[PDB]
Each structure stands twice: as structure tokens, then as C-alpha cells.
Amino acid sequence: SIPDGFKKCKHLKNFPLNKQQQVWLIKFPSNVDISKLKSLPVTTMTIDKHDYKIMDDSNMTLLVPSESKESLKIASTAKDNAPLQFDKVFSVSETAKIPAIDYSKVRVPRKDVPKVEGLKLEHFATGY
């Protein structure tokens, strides 16, 4: 039951995997322009005047296309019939800067109840 609106990829690009190259899985938010991704740390990078967190983090398998460019074969280089687990994995997450509290302004000593003004003798002895 092929879904409507879905077109099979009749051809696919290659995947040049043969100290040999390691395979990394890296996440990005939508708020990152992956096109002009100039560089990535190993960590509080600045991208488009915006800061992101970078840290390190197997169920997920790798689907590398075979020599047909019509489907995917499971990656394996050590010949163990087991997926080639990523040699290192990194993650990218948003960060924000929380303002430090100005205790110098927010620690207000208590103001005493303000004395009324214009207070004079409203009571006098009888006959005065």
C-alpha cells in the first residue's frame, strides 16, 4: 500500500565509508542553518548571533545504500552481522542566558508607615 503523495527515491547519493573515519550522529534544532554550518565544537558556540549547547550523548541503526541506489543495506565493517555502532555521538541544543538577580535593587529595606502631617491639637478642655 504505497502512500499517496510519496515518491520513491529511484536514485540516491553515495556514502563514502570504507585511524579510519569515525561515524557520528549529531542533532540540530530547526533554529540552526545547517546549510552554512561553518564549524562545530567538540562547546558553547555562537551561530547567527545565537548560542547553542554542544555535548556528547545502540538502538539506532545506520541505513547505508548498497551498490544499487534503490534501497539501503545495514552498515557493517567488522563482519559480525551487527550494525557498526557510532564511534562517537554528539548533541546540539538551544541555550539561553538568565539574568542574574540585582539584589542591590531588589533587597529594599522596609519603609515605616508614613506619619500623617498637619496634625494639631483637635481637643480642648470645656469652655475653651
Binding site: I2, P3, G5, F6, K7, K8, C9, L12, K13, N14, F15, P16, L17, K19, Q20, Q21, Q22, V23, W24, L25, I26, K27, F28, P29, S30, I34, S35, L37, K38, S39, L40, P41, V42, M45, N59, M60, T61, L62, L63, V64, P65, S66, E70, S71, L72, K73, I74, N81, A82, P83, K88
Partner: protein
Amino acid sequence: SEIEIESVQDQPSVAVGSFFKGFRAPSDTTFDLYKKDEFVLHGENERLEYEGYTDSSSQASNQYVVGLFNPEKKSIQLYKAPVLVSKVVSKSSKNLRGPKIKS
């Protein structure tokens, strides 16, 4: 330090599957990759079906990448390879039902 980027590959080149823990597959399994960056995968064999699809709720915000990192260099071979959840059905008992209504 920081790591350089060679070329982000926006065209579908790699895919990522998440079947379950400790999953291994026969050497004669292949998967059908459809596009609409959402994908809906399908792989078949004698007794099983690899019926899978992406989650549109998660993909519209997060985007993944698979990359090859040179040790002898300072460059990364980045690729746009999304992750698809996969439910492995069995041909043995996929079409096994019962009567419509009990009298």
C-alpha cells in the same frame, strides 16, 4: 576545539532506523524509501514486513545528521539522514482475523 564542515547534503542519501533493542536483520533485507523531508519506509522478506514511518510532530522541530569525521584531518562529512521509527510486522500472522460478529 571546533570541527570544520565539508558539505551538508540536503538530498536524501542516508536513513536511520530504530526497530528495538538488539535488532539484527538478514543479509537479504532492503527498504523502500519514499519522500513527501518526511519519509515512509517499507521492507519485506518471506515472513516479516518492515512497516515504518516518521513522526511529523517531532520532525517539524528537530533535525538529525549523520557525519563522517576524519581523524587525519579537521573535517566532517555531514549528511541529512532522518530517523524513522519501525514496527516489524510478521507475514506469518499479519492477515489472521476472526469472524465479524458472534451470534
